[PDB]
Write a protein that binds this ligand. Sequence first.
Ligand SMILES: Nc1ncnc2c1ncn2[C@@H]1O[C@@H]2COP(=O)(O)O[C@H]2[C@H]1O
Ligand SMILES: Nc1ncnc2c1ncn2[C@@H]1O[C@@H]2COP(=O)(O)O[C@H]2[C@H]1O
Lengths: 201, 197
Amino acid sequence: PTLEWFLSHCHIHKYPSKSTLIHQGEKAETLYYIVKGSVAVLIKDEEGKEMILSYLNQGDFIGELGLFEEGQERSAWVRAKTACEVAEISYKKFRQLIQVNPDILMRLSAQMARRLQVTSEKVGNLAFLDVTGRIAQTLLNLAKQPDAMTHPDGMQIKITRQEIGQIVGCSRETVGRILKMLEDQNLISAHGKTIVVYGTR
Amino acid sequence: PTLEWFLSHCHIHKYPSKSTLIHQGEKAETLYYIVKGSVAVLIKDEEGKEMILSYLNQGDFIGELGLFEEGQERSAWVRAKTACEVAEISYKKFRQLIQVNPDILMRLSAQMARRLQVTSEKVGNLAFLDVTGRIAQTLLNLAKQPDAMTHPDGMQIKITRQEIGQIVGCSRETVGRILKMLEDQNLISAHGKTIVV
DNA sequence: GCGAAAAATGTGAT
DNA sequence: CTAGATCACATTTTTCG
DNA sequence: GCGAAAAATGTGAT
DNA sequence: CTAGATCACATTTTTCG
Ligand SMILES: Nc1ncnc2c1ncn2[C@@H]1O[C@@H]2COP(=O)(O)O[C@H]2[C@H]1O
Ligand SMILES: Nc1ncnc2c1ncn2[C@@H]1O[C@@H]2COP(=O)(O)O[C@H]2[C@H]1O
């Protein structure tokens, strides 16, 4: 399949858990593709707080927002979540490749298009909702996220309050008090391993 | 170049001051092109409010997200800040134009990455800044803009308080109560006009 | 599948 | 314990015929 | 090159 | 008016050699 033409030119490498895959600011060097495992992508403010903006899992393409112009600094931080294998090709060679088969360039644009639907939703969520709203919404998202392991009354996830405050944009104390709130209503069962129960699965 | 070959196949239309060229929610088929004019992409909440998620101008492709996922919704709302001239091609045709001269595709994919980029910044200005912070860089970015006039020494953009309010995500009454404060803290001077120094 | 050490947490007036 | 929202309604600024 | 209506605004506790 | 951040350390639970 078309993928294998790229995945052959693209050098697979092992990256351990927590291993800072890409750093913000550097200069657009390679094009990356996750052949096993997962990744987190985050930015930080005036200086200090990091905020997650997306994860990405098997089959995505990291760092492609340079590719179409020259001299772009890295957009943001990309830090491995679980250990993963991120294969890669040099920008210059990607282009030459695009012409010998452009239906992978097609496949890239797909991700570069959907990621902005998701991201424009985010602006939505941080402008129109309040933290309880964002949290509730996010838990549903994460249930959808491939990470989840089923539990006989809803999708299970083992994430942490610190991280929710980080995706949600709020101090982890408020995560503590709201996750408690949605528990004393039966929307949530929660001990480190959280299960947001919506019935159906 | 690749541009004039591409365009030709596009029914060209002249939408007037504040038309609605894409209603959010509806069906996707048209990949538009502003051959002249300017757009304001919005998102709206079922209850009253909206957020100016982007300005788009001449040269920009529009309604591009449908194209790879067959069967979809029109992500947001495109309105019209001035009389424009927009071109149009059926997606399934555009897809054929891809597979004969693949340069036009790049030009959209590049239109995207720059967007993906500026929007991810928007995300952050919301999770990290004061209203003052926000209004402030909004008065800066609004000067890196095709429609702003190089006033005596600096940029003179016109844009109203409710307008800045929609971009920022803050109330109108705060916006005014605040930007005129960036005047004592001599960063701007205004009067309908916002003569960012 | 350990248990020492490393990380996450939560509670309240302002 | 601080930032920014929410009240109507005249005064004020802007809109082209 | 000028006059109505029309958009937009400011404020002030809380 | 009202929502959440927040300071600081006991205590609880999750990571890793
Ligand atoms: N909003 C976003 N959503 C998803 N991925 C993003 C977003 N912003 C940046 N990225 C990714 O993060 C990478 C960091 O810089 P690159 O230009 O290498 O490529 C970027 C994209 O792969
Ligand atoms: N983040 C964004 N920045 C700029 N324009 C956008 C953004 N999100 C959506 N749009 C544009 O608005 C269009 C709405 O309909 P489409 O999804 O067809 O395609 C969308 C884009 O062209």
